[PDB]
Design a protein around this ligand. Structure first.
Ligand SMILES: CCCCCCCCCCCCCCCCCC(=O)OC[C@H](COP(=O)([O-])OCC(O)COP(=O)([O-])OC[C@@H](COC(=O)CCCCCCCCCCCCCCCCC)OC(=O)CCCCCCCCCCCCCCCCC)OC(=O)CCCCCCCCCCCCCCCCC
Ligand SMILES: CCCCCCCCCCCCCCCCCC(=O)OC[C@H](COP(=O)([O-])OCC[N+](C)(C)C)OC(=O)CCCCCCCCCCCCCCCCC
Lengths: 37, 70
């Protein structure tokens, strides 16, 4: 670019329209441990 | 004094409003005969099917609670 070289592989513009359906995933702060007394 | 004998109101007991407590102390004392026969968890069940038996065989080591299943 402006007196600078940034080596990157060939960009694929088709990756923009990649169908990625969102999946359910819930985090439970406060859950089960490995062992109990 | 017998609970059964006081039911007819003909021996020594006409009105006994707590006659249904008469055999609680004797039944409790007779149950004390198994005080030492059934002491602790191992004497009241088949211990190898309980979790504490596994901890003993592992050298008194803590195990996950589902160790009996895996
Ligand atoms: C084949 C072999 C050879 C055969 C021939 C030879 C054998 C011949 C006979 C030999 C000797 C046998 C001894 C008995 C005959 C003696 C005759 C006599 O005159 O004696 C008088 C004798 C004289 O009195 P005593 O000498 O001054 O003192 C007597 C005792 O020291 C203590 O006296 P006590 O009066 O103070 O004791 C009272 C106690 C006596 O103990 C018991 O009898 C236990 C009773 C528990 C059962 C109560 C049932 C309640 C009603 C249920 C109705 C449906 C039943 C369905 C059942 C289905 C079962 C799954 O009963 C109670 O505690 C009553 C209160 C119970 C608490 C409240 C429960 C009721 C309210 C809750 C209701 C819930 C449901 C509500 C809704 C219902 C739906 C509408 O008194 C006796 O009764 C003696 C019996 C003592 C036990 C003897 C056991 C000897 C060992 C034998 C093996 C066991 C056999 C008995 C098993 C019974 C089943 C559990
Ligand atoms: C399949 C189950 C049902 C069977 C049939 C129904 C039987 C009754 C249910 C079973 C009850 C058993 C548990 C409780 C035991 C009694 C507890 C009690 O308090 O009793 C003290 C009583 C004492 O009564 P009491 O009158 O002497 O003194 C009590 C006085 N007060 C009330 C003031 C305290 O004795 C009894 O046994 C009474 C119950 C008798 C039930 C008998 C039913 C049948 C009657 C005889 C057959 C008659 C056929 C026709 C005859 C023709 C001429 C010969």
């Amino acid at each position: 670019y402006e007196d600078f070289v940034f080596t990157t592989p060939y960009f694929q513009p088709e990756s923009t329209f990649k169908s990625v359906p969102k999946l359910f995933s819930d985090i439970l702060l406060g859950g089960v441990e490995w062992v109990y007394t | 004094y017998s609970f059964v004998k006081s039911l007819t109101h003909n021996g020594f007991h006409m009105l006994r409003v707590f006659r249904h407590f008469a055999f609680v102390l004797p039944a409790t004392v007779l149950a004390g005969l198994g005080l030492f026969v059934y002491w602790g968890d191992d004497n009241k069940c088949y211990s190898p099917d309980r979790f504490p038996y596994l901890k003993k065989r592992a050298g008194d080591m803590a195990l996950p609670l589902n160790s009996l299943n895996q």
